[PDB]
Structure 1
Amino acid sequence: ADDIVLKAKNGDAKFPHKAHQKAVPDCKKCHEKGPGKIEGFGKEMAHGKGCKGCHEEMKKGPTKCGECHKK
């Protein structure tokens, strides 16, 4: 399947799966979650544990605005 881009108004936020499959061998961090995760994602999640928060916790991945968001 293809990578997806989240259409944030301030700039497209791409999600490259291959890098994540490699750097996050604990697949259950994102997969096999209960229901609601598709409906639940948004800016709050993205800037929290959904994206940015994991990068901070794992000490790796983009944590600056212009690193995730790109027009």
Structure 2
Amino acid sequence: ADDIVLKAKNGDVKFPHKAHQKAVPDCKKCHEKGPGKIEGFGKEMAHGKGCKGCHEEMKKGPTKCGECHKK
């Protein structure tokens, strides 16, 4: 649905694929080739302009460790 768990060898990341909708009604923001899986995505990405990127972008959202990686 919206709740998506991103397996990580450094602590899984709980991503709410919902609140990120009303906050970013634009799905073309992340989904470039349309809704679906994202090819290439990864660490550098998540930390880059994948997750934090946006976060640190607006200074909103978890940008510190532990806030994403929960053991």
Same fold, TM-score > 0.5, yes or no: yes
Q: Comparing both structures, which one devotes a greater share of its residues to helix?
A: 1
Cα RMSD between the aligned structures? 2.4
Identity of aligned residues (%): 99
Distance 2:66 2:46 in 1: 14
Kept in 1, the 8 Å contact 2:27–2:35? The answer is no
Unmatched tracts of structure 1, length 5 or more = none
Deviations 1:3-54 (A, max 9, x none): 2111111111011011101211232111243799633011010100000100
Partners of 1:2 and 1:60 in 2: CA distance: 20
Length-normalised TM-score, structure 1: 0.82
What is the CA–CA distance in structure 1 between the aligned matches of 2:35 and 2:27, rounded to whole Å?
Answer: 16
Q: Name the CA shift for 1:29/1:12 in 2 (closer, same or farther; >3 Å).
A: same
Question: Number of paired residues?
Answer: 71
Query: Which stretch shows the higher mean deviation, 22-31 or 36-45?
Result: 36-45
Shift of 1:66: 0.6
Q: Secondary structure at the match of 1:36?
A: coil
After TM superposition, the score normalised by the length of structure 2 is: 0.82
Q: Which residues of structure 2 form unaligned runs of 5+?
A: none
